[PDB]
C-alpha cells in the first residue's frame, strides 16, 4: 500500500521513560494492507512496529 496526504499531531506528550507520548497520524491509502512504522530519529522510540 502507498500512503499520501499524511498529517501528524501530538495531543499530549510526556518524557516519562514508559512511552509517555502519543501521536495521531492522518493518512490516505491506495489499498488495504500492513505497513511498517519506523522512527527516523534516535531520540524518539516508537513502540509500534
Amino acid at each position: 500500500p502507498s500512503l499520501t496526504d499524511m498529517s501528524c499531531e501530538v495531543p499530549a506528550c510526556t518524557h516519562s521513560s514508559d512511552f509517555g507520548g502519543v501521536a495521531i497520524i492522518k493518512y490516505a491509502a491506495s489499498k488495504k494492507g500492513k505497513c511498517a512504522v519506523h522512527s527516523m530519529t534516535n531520540a524518539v522510540t516508537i513502540r509500534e512496529a
Binding site: 495531543p11 499530549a12 502519543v22 495521531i24
Partner: protein
C-alpha cells in the same frame, strides 16, 4: 426584659447562630482552600476524548 438582640440578629457577615452546642453557621468571611486528591481511574486519556 433588657437583653437586646441575640447574636443571630446582630452578628455581621450574615452569621447564623445556634446553641447546644453553640455554633456560628455560614459566615461569609474569607476563602476556603479545598485540596482534592483524585485517583487516575477518574481521568480520561486525551486520545480517548
Amino acid at each position: 426584659k433588657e437583653r437586646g438582640a441575640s447574636l443571630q440578629h446582630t452578628a455581621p457577615f450574615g452569621c447564623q447562630i445556634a446553641t447546644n452546642p453553640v455554633r456560628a453557621m455560614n459566615c461569609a468571611v474569607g476563602n476556603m482552600p479545598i485540596s482534592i486528591d483524585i485517583p487516575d481511574a477518574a481521568f480520561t486519556r486525551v486520545v480517548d476524548a
